[PDB]
Amino acid sequence: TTVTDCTPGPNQNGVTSVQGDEYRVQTNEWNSSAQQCLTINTATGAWTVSTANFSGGTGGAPATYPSIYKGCHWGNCTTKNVGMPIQISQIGSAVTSWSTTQVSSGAYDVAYDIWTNSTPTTTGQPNGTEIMIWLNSRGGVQPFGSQTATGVTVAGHTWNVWQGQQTSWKIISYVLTPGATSISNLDLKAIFADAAARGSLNTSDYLLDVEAGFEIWQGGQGLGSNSFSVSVTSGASHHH
Ligand SMILES: OC[C@H]1O[C@@H](O[C@H]2[C@H](O)[C@@H](O)[C@H](O)O[C@@H]2CO)[C@H](O)[C@@H](O)[C@@H]1O
Ligand SMILES: [Cl-]
Ligand code: NA
Ligand code: NA
Ligand SMILES: [Zn+2]
Ligand SMILES: [Zn+2]
Ligand SMILES: [Zn+2]
Ligand SMILES: [Zn+2]
Ligand SMILES: [Zn+2]
């Protein structure tokens, strides 16, 4: 069925299990109490920002990051066919696809948020790397830190790379150039190898989760997720 979740931030997070709890959709209004509603299809995992009209500047922190994820966010973990936590260096393959709905108004990014951590579990802020993958953005926002590379080829696409330092973790943001509304079979293992070559990622870290959604500074109504998949593997074959 379809569920609507308007859980107000900044201190509450409304989390909805979709597709047999292979994915969770979170309101995650971590920096605002302004109205934000998500409408979520629990059979398909499709979701929309059905009500939002954020107000504020385009600099600094966004208001919110409503998102879908596989894995663990601040100890809230999916439970079907997860494949995480896993040491980065032990991944056989890691692939994701995301199809979005965008609006030509407001100030937002359309981004993956991928967390790594020194230990396989945490109840809070991961301490390794935050890997962001910006499919698109508008309204004057930019990534955290500084732009350190322009027009590089990684995992079959062209990016600008931004690197920064947070209070207890490193951030690297891959900005698809030009931006787009979807990406198909993105090789995250290739992104991790690149992030490690650029000095942003320790491949001994555990991959905790793969999230996708919208950091919103202004507006936000009508942004959505049409389809989302993440597959992280190896171990070994064994029909039993
Ligand atoms: O505050 C975390 C937030 O930073 C965002 O980037 C800021 C940047 O740090 C600031 O120097 C510049 O003035 O504004 C941008 C936003 O436009 C980053 O985009 C977010 O991913 C991150 O959550
Ligand atoms: Cl920085
Ligand atoms: Na599945
Ligand atoms: Na602001
Ligand atoms: Zn959160
Ligand atoms: Zn961040
Ligand atoms: Zn491309
Ligand atoms: Zn493309
Ligand atoms: Zn690869």
Side-chain angles (χ1 to χ4, degrees):
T1 51
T2 293
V3 302
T4 293
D5 189 351
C6 304
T7 302
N11 304 312
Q12 300 171 284
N13 192 2
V15 185
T16 301
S17 173
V18 308
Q19 297 170 273
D21 207 38
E22 186 167 3
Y23 300 96
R24 281 170 186 205
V25 179
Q26 55 173 0
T27 59
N28 192 215
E29 191 182 15
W30 65 266
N31 195 36
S32 183
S33 66
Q35 176 65 314
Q36 178 192 261
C37 296
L38 301 190
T39 303
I40 303 162
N41 182 325
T42 66
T44 69
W47 55 272
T48 316
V49 184
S50 53
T51 307
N53 188 14
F54 288 99
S55 226
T58 55
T64 193
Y65 181 58
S67 44
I68 180 164
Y69 63 95
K70 179 174 273 187
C72 290
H73 181 92
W74 274 247
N76 185 300
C77 309
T78 64
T79 63
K80 173 176 166 181
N81 189 35
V82 194
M84 285 162 289
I86 186 165
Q87 193 163 62
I88 292 288
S89 65
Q90 303 309 303
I91 293 175
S93 71
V95 189
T96 185
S97 298
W98 192 29
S99 171
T100 75
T101 291
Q102 296 178 27
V103 308
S104 300
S105 190
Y108 64 83
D109 66 36
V110 182
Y112 286 85
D113 210 25
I114 300 167
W115 291 105
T116 80
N117 193 73
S118 63
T119 61
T121 67
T122 182
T123 57
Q125 175 60 62
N127 70 13
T129 304
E130 189 186 356
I131 297 177
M132 297 201 91
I133 312 176
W134 289 28
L135 274 67
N136 208 8
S137 65
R138 61 167 283 124
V141 298
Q142 71 183 224
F144 196 92
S146 298
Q147 185 169 339
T148 63
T150 305
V152 299
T153 303
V154 183
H157 301 276
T158 301
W159 314 90
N160 298 336
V161 175
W162 291 64
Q163 285 168 290
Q165 178 73 54
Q166 262 285 12
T167 52
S168 58
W169 71 97
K170 295 179 163 188
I171 184 171
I172 181 171
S173 305
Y174 290 85
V175 173
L176 188 66
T177 307
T181 69
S182 74
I183 197 161
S184 181
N185 300 314
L186 176 66
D187 185 355
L188 293 180
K189 190 188 186 179
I191 297 284
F192 298 149
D194 182 78
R198 295 189 194 273
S200 281
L201 173 62
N202 185 332
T203 63
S204 73
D205 285 2
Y206 288 85
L207 172 63
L208 295 185
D209 80 342
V210 178
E211 321 186 4
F214 306 93
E215 302 186 285
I216 307 158
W217 283 260
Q218 304 172 337
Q221 198 158 296
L223 298 177
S225 178
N226 302 308
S227 54
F228 175 76
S229 55
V230 174
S231 178
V232 177
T233 77
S234 29
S237 168
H238 187 60
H239 306 41
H240 184 149

